[PDB]
Amino acid sequence: MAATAAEAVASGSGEPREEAGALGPAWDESQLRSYSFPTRPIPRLSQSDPRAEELIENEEPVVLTDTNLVYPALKWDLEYLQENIGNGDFSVYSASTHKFLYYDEKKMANFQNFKPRSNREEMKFHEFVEKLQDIQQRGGEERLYLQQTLNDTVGRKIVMDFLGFNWNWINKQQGKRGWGQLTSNLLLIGMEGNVTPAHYDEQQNFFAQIKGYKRCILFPPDQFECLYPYPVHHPCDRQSQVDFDNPDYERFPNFQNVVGYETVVGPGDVLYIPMYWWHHIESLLNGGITITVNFWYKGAPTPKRIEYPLKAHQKVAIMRNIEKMLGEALGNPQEVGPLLNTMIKGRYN
Template structure:
């Protein structure tokens, strides 16, 4: 059974309750939660171990962001929004799609005003939405100024001291309550900053690769687990019983270090408000940036 006794300790200021957490048949313990000044943070990052970092003020200038502010200042461009008939938003690579592959979600371009309207008017049973947009030089000047006022001195020091490559992307994520990004891994270092609402992150180390039965490399769901956490098929995926992970619930201002190649499953808490997050993706090795440039 899930070790939900650790859930109670995940945030110092608990503005949510355990009924908002999905229940999984997985052994889980708490991700270390440390103040920004704790020297153990760098020890964990150097060892490629996850850690929740508090009081960084990394995205302090964005903590006032909400749909109204973004609607006013993001600009009139089109933004990438995924639509799903259920709460799951499993990533797929369109370049690897074949005629017999049916995408689990629809990707559409949407004005932020339309996205905000649909989020405000959303009711259970409606198609779910998830905005996932790289912040680049097309956004409005107020967003640019907020972005430039992030604590770049702090994050740049982490990049330098841990020999990460260049910043490749800042992805803005706006999700409905209860939205789930199923278990997968990324090939970059990630500092995941929570801005609004609460998200639960469940992580597993790369050495448990066999427990998650990833799709074949050439499948559109490459880097995704085939296991459905809510209804695991232990006949097809028996090693999933051996999975042991770590979890944390992130609130506004929290920053989670997700090490490169670590499996992670992310969900906005159920029956809460919409959530807003930004990730800072860094290459594992030095590489040149490519257009469009991330802000900064």
């Protein structure tokens, strides 16, 4: 029965992997939040597996289990980083809810009726750690999520760890895919339960898990119609307007058709998040703090002769450009919507 046959391939992250030396289940289902949509698993392969190379060349997610990409960082933890990360400033987001929706500040100018559910604040690593402890011991509920690009200002031992990354492997990946340069490395440290809502990036991403576990739920670019991203000029550009915890099927009917790809990554796993793929990321409930470092690369330059039909991500690119052009022409982003409706109502719908 196809219905049942399907209810089966809709595993999710699957049965929890077992830790070496019989240290028990890495994590368990009750640590995962519950959503309204189905999900099949992202393949977990070895970098030496020809399949893994296949998925990447073909822009599909895959978790590489043995890259040693950030092997030297697997020793990182709060104590170690405070002693060696530097006296530099670290962007730290604070929020009331478990949801840390990203917002673009340079865009906060066009939409003033927008109020951030989470606020940013610069800190010295020890401050973040301090504030983390107050909350921790005082049993508070304020959630924090440090997210900072690793810059010229980190300490000596961190720079050392950095040099020990597996540049041989990734550089070859950058080379074989024609990608552009590495644009940055984002360091993320969050509290258990922290959620990064579904959104997509215009960067190729190698997501290297370091400490703790993270459940990653991705959606292919062709599910744009089911995820309803905010307007291109809105601060939450690229983020989904749908609240996965309380989805509004009236406003977002096609979210009822969404199908995800998930997996739980841990210390040493590297998840390839292809450019334009939506991803929702959550730190397992009661799993402790999580540490991750990503590698963002500019995508490869678009082929000179366009081949048809277009790939989903090229249509998404086209839609974004229309919204931007219209923004410039009308001289005001607020008017994009009204003109678009006028263009389709009774004509294309």
